[PDB]
Amino acid sequence: IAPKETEVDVLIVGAGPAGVMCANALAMAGVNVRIIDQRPVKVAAGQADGIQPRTIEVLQSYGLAERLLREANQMQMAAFYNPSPSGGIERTSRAPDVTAPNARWPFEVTLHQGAIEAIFLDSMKAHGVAVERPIIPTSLELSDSEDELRDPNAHPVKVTLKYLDPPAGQSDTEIVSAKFVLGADGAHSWVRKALGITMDGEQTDYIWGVIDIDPDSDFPDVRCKTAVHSHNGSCMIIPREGDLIRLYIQLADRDVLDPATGRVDKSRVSPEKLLAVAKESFKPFSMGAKNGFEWWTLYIIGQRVASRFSLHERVFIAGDACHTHSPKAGQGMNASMNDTHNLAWKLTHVLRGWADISVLKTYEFERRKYAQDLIDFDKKFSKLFSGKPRTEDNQDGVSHEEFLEAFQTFGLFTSGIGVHYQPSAITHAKHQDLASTLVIGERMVPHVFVRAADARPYDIQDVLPADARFKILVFTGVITDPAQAARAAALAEEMDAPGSFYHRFGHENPARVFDVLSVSAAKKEDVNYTDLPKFFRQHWSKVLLDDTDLYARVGGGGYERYGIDAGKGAIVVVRPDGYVGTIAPLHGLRDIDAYFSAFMAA
Amino acid sequence: IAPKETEVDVLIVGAGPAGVMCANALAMAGVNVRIIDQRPVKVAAGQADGIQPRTIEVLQSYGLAERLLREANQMQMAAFYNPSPSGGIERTSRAPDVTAPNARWPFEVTLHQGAIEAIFLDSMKAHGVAVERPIIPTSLELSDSEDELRDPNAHPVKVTLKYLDPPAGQSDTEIVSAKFVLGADGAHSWVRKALGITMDGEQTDYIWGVIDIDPDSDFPDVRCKTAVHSHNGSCMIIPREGDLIRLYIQLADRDVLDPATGRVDKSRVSPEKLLAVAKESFKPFSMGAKNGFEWWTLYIIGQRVASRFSLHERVFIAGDACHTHSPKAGQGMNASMNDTHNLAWKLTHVLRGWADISVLKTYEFERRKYAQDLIDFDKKFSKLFSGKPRTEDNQDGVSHEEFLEAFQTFGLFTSGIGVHYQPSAITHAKHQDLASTLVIGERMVPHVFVRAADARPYDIQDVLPADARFKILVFTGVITDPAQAARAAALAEEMDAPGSFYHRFGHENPARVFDVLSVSAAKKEDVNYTDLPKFFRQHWSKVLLDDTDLYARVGGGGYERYGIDAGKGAIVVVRPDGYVGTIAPLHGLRDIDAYFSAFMAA
Ligand SMILES: Cc1cc2nc3c(=O)[nH]c(=O)nc-3n(C[C@H](O)[C@H](O)[C@H](O)COP(=O)(O)OP(=O)(O)OC[C@H]3O[C@@H](n4cnc5c(N)ncnc54)[C@H](O)[C@@H]3O)c2cc1C
Ligand SMILES: Cc1cc2nc3c(=O)[nH]c(=O)nc-3n(C[C@H](O)[C@H](O)[C@H](O)COP(=O)(O)OP(=O)(O)OC[C@H]3O[C@@H](n4cnc5c(N)ncnc54)[C@H](O)[C@@H]3O)c2cc1C
Amino acid at B516: V
Class of domain B432-597: alpha beta
Torsion sign over Cα A553, A558, A560, A566: negative
Q: Give, for A490, the enclosing helix (H) or strand (E).
A: helix A482-496
Q: Report yes or no: A445 and A102 within 8 Å, Cβ to Cβ.
A: yes
Amino acid at B73: N
Tell me how far apart the alpha carbons of residues A362 and A346 are, in angstroms, rounded to a whole number. Answer: 9
Among A436, A332, A352, residue whose Cα is nearest residue A153: A352
Tell me how far apart the alpha carbons of residues B593 and B595 are, in angstroms, rounded to a whole number. Answer: 5
Tell me how far apart the alpha carbons of residues B451 and B523 are, in angstroms, rounded to a whole number. Answer: 10
- Nearest by CB to residue B454, choosing from A77, A453, A529, is A77
Contact with chain B for residue A81, Cβ under 8 A = no
DSSP B500-515: SHHHHTSTT-GGGTEE
> For domain B206-300, is the CATH number 3.30.9.10?
yes
Tell me how far apart the alpha carbons of residues B314 and B155 are, in angstroms, rounded to a whole number. Answer: 9
Q: Give, for A367, the enclosing helix (H) or strand (E).
A: helix A361-381
Tell me how far apart the alpha carbons of residues A458 and B95 are, in angstroms, rounded to a whole number. Answer: 19
Tell me how far apart the alpha carbons of residues B85 and B154 are, in angstroms, rounded to a whole number. Answer: 69
What's the gap in Å between B354 CA and the centre of ligand 2?
34
Give the binding-site residues of ligand 2, using a 6 Å CB cut-off: B 13-14, 16-19, 36-39, 46-48, 113, 136-137, 184-186, 190, 210, 297, 299, 319-320, 327, 332-333, 336
Paired residues of A110 in beta bridges: A50, A73
Q: Report yes or no: B179 and B152 within 8 Å, Cβ to Cβ.
A: yes
Paired residues of B174 in beta bridges: B4, B161
Q: Encode B3-27: b = buried (16+ Cβ within 10 Å), e = exposed.
A: eeeeebbbbbbbbbbbbbbbbbbbb
Query: Does the C-beta of A190 come closer than 6 Å to ligand 1?
Result: yes
What's the gap in Å between B377 CA and the centre of ligand 1?
65
The CB density around residue A267, as the number of other CB atoms within 10 Å, is 8
- Return all residues near B10 (Cβ < 8 A) that are at least 6 apart: B26, B31, B32, B33, B34, B178, B179, B180, B181, B182, B347, B351
Q: Report yes or no: B57 and B105 within 8 Å, Cβ to Cβ.
A: yes
Distance from CA of A447 to the nearest CA of B (A): 14
Contact with chain B for residue A65, Cβ under 8 A = no
DSSP B482-494: HHHHHHHHHHHHH
Domain span(s) for CATH 3.30.9.10 in chain B:
206-300
Tell me how far apart the alpha carbons of residues A270 and A253 are, in angstroms, rounded to a whole number. Answer: 15
Tell me how far apart the alpha carbons of residues A47 and A53 are, in angstroms, rounded to a whole number. Answer: 19
Q: Report yes or no: A543 and A451 within 8 Å, Cβ to Cβ.
A: yes
Domain span(s) for CATH 3.50.50.60 in chain A:
4-70+112-202+304-369
Q: Report yes or no: B540 and B532 within 8 Å, Cβ to Cβ.
A: no
- Nearest by CB to residue A530, choosing from B75, B220, B455, is B220
Among B47, B99, B51, residue whose Cα is nearest residue B77: B99
Q: Give, for B195, the enclosing helix (H) or strand (E).
A: helix B190-195
Taking an 8 Å cut-off on Cβ atoms, the answer to whether B454 and A540 are in contact is: no
Amino acid at A490: A
- Closest A-chain CA to B100: A551
Among A151, A195, A184, residue whose Cα is nearest residue A38: A184
Ligand 1 atom with the shortest distance to the CA of A324: 19
Experimental technique for the deposited model = X-ray
Tell me how far apart the alpha carbons of residues A581 and A600 are, in angstroms, rounded to a whole number. Answer: 14
Dmax (CA) for chain A in angstroms is: 87
Tell me how far apart the alpha carbons of residues B107 and A454 are, in angstroms, rounded to a whole number. Answer: 11
Tell me how far apart the alpha carbons of residues A113 and A39 are, in angstroms, rounded to a whole number. Answer: 15
Tell me how far apart the alpha carbons of residues B517 and B476 are, in angstroms, rounded to a whole number. Answer: 10
- Return all residues near B248 (Cβ < 8 A) that are at least 6 apart: B208, B209, B210, B235, B236, B238, B299, B327
Q: Give, for B474, the enclosing helix (H) or strand (E).
A: strand B470-477
CA angle B433, B435, B440 (to 5 degrees): 85
Among A415, A330, A402, residue whose Cα is nearest residue A100: A415
User: Which of the listed residues A20, A164, A185 should we mutate to test ligand 1's pocket, taking the one with most ligand atoms within 8 A of CB?
Assistant: A185
Beta strands in B129-186 (DSSP E): 131-132, 135-142, 157-163, 173-183
Taking an 8 Å cut-off on Cβ atoms, the answer to whether B239 and A66 are in contact is: no
Chain-centroid distance of CA A517 in Å reads 25
Contact with chain A for residue B101, Cβ under 8 A = yes
Q: Please give the backbone phi and psi of residue A347, each rounded to the nearest 5 degrees, phi first.
A: -60, -45
DSSP A127-190: TT--EE-SEEEEEEEE---HHHHH-TTS--EEEEEEESSPPTTS-SEEEEEEEEEEE---TT-H
What's the gap in Å between B400 CA and the centre of ligand 1?
70
Contact with chain B for residue A101, Cβ under 8 A = yes
The CB density around residue B537, as the number of other CB atoms within 10 Å, is 20
Tell me how far apart the alpha carbons of residues A304 and A320 are, in angstroms, rounded to a whole number. Answer: 9
DSSP code of B516? Answer: E
Paired residues of B406 in beta bridges: none
Say which ligand is closest to the CA of A39. 1
Q: Please give the backbone phi and psi of residue A91, each rounded to the nearest 5 degrees, phi first.
A: -80, 130
Among B49, B152, B150, residue whose Cα is nearest residue B109: B49
Tell me how far apart the alpha carbons of residues A601 and A153 are, in angstroms, rounded to a whole number. Answer: 14
Q: Report yes or no: A15 and A131 within 8 Å, Cβ to Cβ.
A: yes
Q: Report yes or no: B145 and B314 within 8 Å, Cβ to Cβ.
A: no
Q: Report yes or no: B42 and B114 within 8 Å, Cβ to Cβ.
A: yes
Contact with chain B for residue A538, Cβ under 8 A = no
Could you give the residue ranges of the DSSP H alpha helices within B358-450? 361-381, 400-415
Say which ligand is closest to the CA of A306. 1
Query: Between the CA atoms of A194, A199, A203 and A206, what dihedral angle is there, to the nearest 10 degrees?
Result: -90
Tell me how far apart the alpha carbons of residues B99 and A432 are, in angstroms, rounded to a whole number. Answer: 43
> Exposed, middle or buried, B111 (CB in 10 Å: 0-12/13-18/19+)?
buried
Chain A residues within an 8 Å CB radius of B415:
none
Paired residues of B427 in beta bridges: B424
Whole-number Cα distances in Å, A35 to A20, A232, A442, B469, B577: 8, 46, 30, 47, 48
Tell me how far apart the alpha carbons of residues B550 and A106 are, in angstroms, rounded to a whole number. Answer: 9
Contacts 24+ apart (CB under 8 A), A163-172: A163/A134, A163/A135, A164/A38, A164/A40, A164/A134, A164/A135, A164/A136, A165/A40, A165/A134, A169/A1, A170/A1, A171/A1, A171/A2, A171/A3, A171/A4, A172/A1
Could you give the residue ranges of the DSSP H alpha helices within B50-183? 53-61, 65-71, 113-126, 146-150
User: Which of the listed residues A299, A301, A340 should we mutate to test ligand 1's pocket, taking the one with most ligand atoms within 8 A of CB?
Assistant: A299
Amino acid at A379: K
Interface test with B, best of A68, A73, A77 (most B CBs within 10 A): A77
Torsion sign over Cα B42, B43, B47, B53: positive
Tell me how far apart the alpha carbons of residues B325 and B335 are, in angstroms, rounded to a whole number. Answer: 9
Q: Report yes or no: A556 and A473 within 8 Å, Cβ to Cβ.
A: no
Q: Report yes or no: A96 and B454 within 8 Å, Cβ to Cβ.
A: no
Amino acid at B350: V
Say which ligand is closest to the CA of B271. 2
> Exposed, middle or buried, B523 (CB in 10 Å: 0-12/13-18/19+)?
middle
Active site residues of B: 49, 240, 248, 327
Amino acid at B328: K
Distance from CA of A34 to the nearest CA of B (A): 30
Q: Give, for B593, the enclosing helix (H) or strand (E).
A: helix B589-597
Tell me how far apart the alpha carbons of residues B439 and B423 are, in angstroms, rounded to a whole number. Answer: 12
Q: Report yes or no: B236 and B228 within 8 Å, Cβ to Cβ.
A: yes
Three-state helix/strand/coil letters over A221-267: CCCCEEEEECCCCEEEEEECCCCCEEEEEEECHHHHECCCCCCECHH
Chain A residues within an 8 Å CB radius of B465:
none
Distance from CA of B399 to the nearest CA of A (A): 27
Taking an 8 Å cut-off on Cβ atoms, the answer to whether A76 and B101 are in contact is: no
Tell me how far apart the alpha carbons of residues A426 and A362 are, in angstroms, rounded to a whole number. Answer: 8
Query: Does the C-beta of A326 come closer than 6 Å to ligand 1?
Result: no
Phi-psi category of A300—alpha, beta or left, where left has phi over 0 and alpha has psi -120 to 50? Answer: beta
Tell me how far apart the alpha carbons of residues A356 and A350 are, in angstroms, rounded to a whole number. Answer: 6
Tell me how far apart the alpha carbons of residues B600 and B593 are, in angstroms, rounded to a whole number. Answer: 10
Tell me how far apart the alpha carbons of residues B47 and A142 are, in angstroms, rounded to a whole number. Answer: 63
Q: Report yes or no: B250 and B210 within 8 Å, Cβ to Cβ.
A: no
Tell me how far apart the alpha carbons of residues A142 and A161 are, in angstroms, rounded to a whole number. Answer: 15
Domain span(s) for CATH 3.30.9.10 in chain A:
206-301
- Nearest by CB to residue B96, choosing from A454, A456, A550, is A550
Tell me how far apart the alpha carbons of residues A558 and A564 are, in angstroms, rounded to a whole number. Answer: 8
Task: Count how many Cα atoms sit within 13 Å of the Cα of residue B170 in the half-sphere of its side chain.
Answer: 11
Ligand 2 atom with the shortest distance to the CA of B297: 8
Tell me how far apart the alpha carbons of residues B129 and B133 are, in angstroms, rounded to a whole number. Answer: 13
- Return all residues near B80 (Cβ < 8 A) that are at least 6 apart: B91, B92, B93, B94, B95, B226, B227, B387, B389
Bridge pairing between strands A108-110 and A245-251: unpaired
Among B343, B281, B235, residue whose Cα is nearest residue B89: B281
Fold of A206-301: D-Amino Acid Oxidase; Chain A, domain 2 (3.30.9)
Q: After which residues is chain B broken (C to N over 2.5 A)?
A: none
Domain A4-70+112-202+304-369 in CATH: superfamily? FAD/NAD(P)-binding domain (3.50.50.60)
What's the gap in Å between B186 CA and the centre of ligand 2?
5
> For domain B4-68+112-200+304-370, is the CATH number 3.50.50.60?
yes
Tell me how far apart the alpha carbons of residues A486 and A479 are, in angstroms, rounded to a whole number. Answer: 9
Omega before residue B446 within 30° of 0, cis: no
Collapsed DSSP state (helix, strand, coil) of residue A17: helix
- Return all residues near B385 (Cβ < 8 A) that are at least 6 apart: B328, B407, B410
Decide if A487 is catalytic.
Answer: no
Decide if A462 is catalytic.
Answer: no
Contact with chain A for residue B54, Cβ under 8 A = no
Contact with chain B for residue A285, Cβ under 8 A = no
Q: Report yes or no: B431 and B582 within 8 Å, Cβ to Cβ.
A: yes
Chain A residues within an 8 Å CB radius of B101:
551
DSSP A264-309: B-GGGS-HHHHHHHHHHHTTTS--EESSS-SEEEEEEE--EEES-S
